Amino acid sequence: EPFDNSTYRNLQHHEYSTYTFLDLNVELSKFRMPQPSSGRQSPRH
Amino acid sequence: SGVNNTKKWKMEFDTRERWENPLMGWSSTADPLSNLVLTFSTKEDAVAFAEKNGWSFDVEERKVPKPKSKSYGANFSWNKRTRVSTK
């Protein structure tokens, strides 16, 4: 209950693996939407 | 990329024999009217000069660049092939 005005809780960022970015980006991939289509699959096609 | 050299009508004559002299292999020639080029504002003046002088003349029309539609927005696109890949 007592709000501690002199503490830090952004500590989970300490124990982050070198892949942590993509480690949860891959999980976040599920909660997405179809990307809009530009027609040709490449700008060179 | 400079342009102000194709804004005049120049007349020049057929090239003739160019042999090498025995001494240093120079470029001795015989026709005096070889390094002779005449300028004219419009081709009508040039052709009038040619006929009145009496030289058999040949005519080539003034080729000019076609104006092409150019836009920087073509360097990028959503679907067009014209999108660039590097700047």
E-strand stretches of chain B: 9-11, 38-40
**Using what technique was this structure determined?**
cryo-EM
The closest alpha carbon to B9, from B41, B56, B53, belongs to B41
Measure the CA dihedral A15/A16/A17/A18, to 10°: -130
Nearest CA in chain A to B85: A43
CA distance B22 to A39: 71
The closest alpha carbon to B8, from B40, B38, B36, belongs to B40
Resolution (angstroms) stands at 3.4
Residues of A whose CB is below 8 A from B78: 38
The closest alpha carbon to B65, from B20, B7, B23, belongs to B7
The answer to whether the beta carbons of residues A40 and B81 sit under 8 Å apart is: yes
The answer to whether the CB atoms of B83 and A43 lie below 8 A apart is yes
Nearest CA in chain A to B81: A43
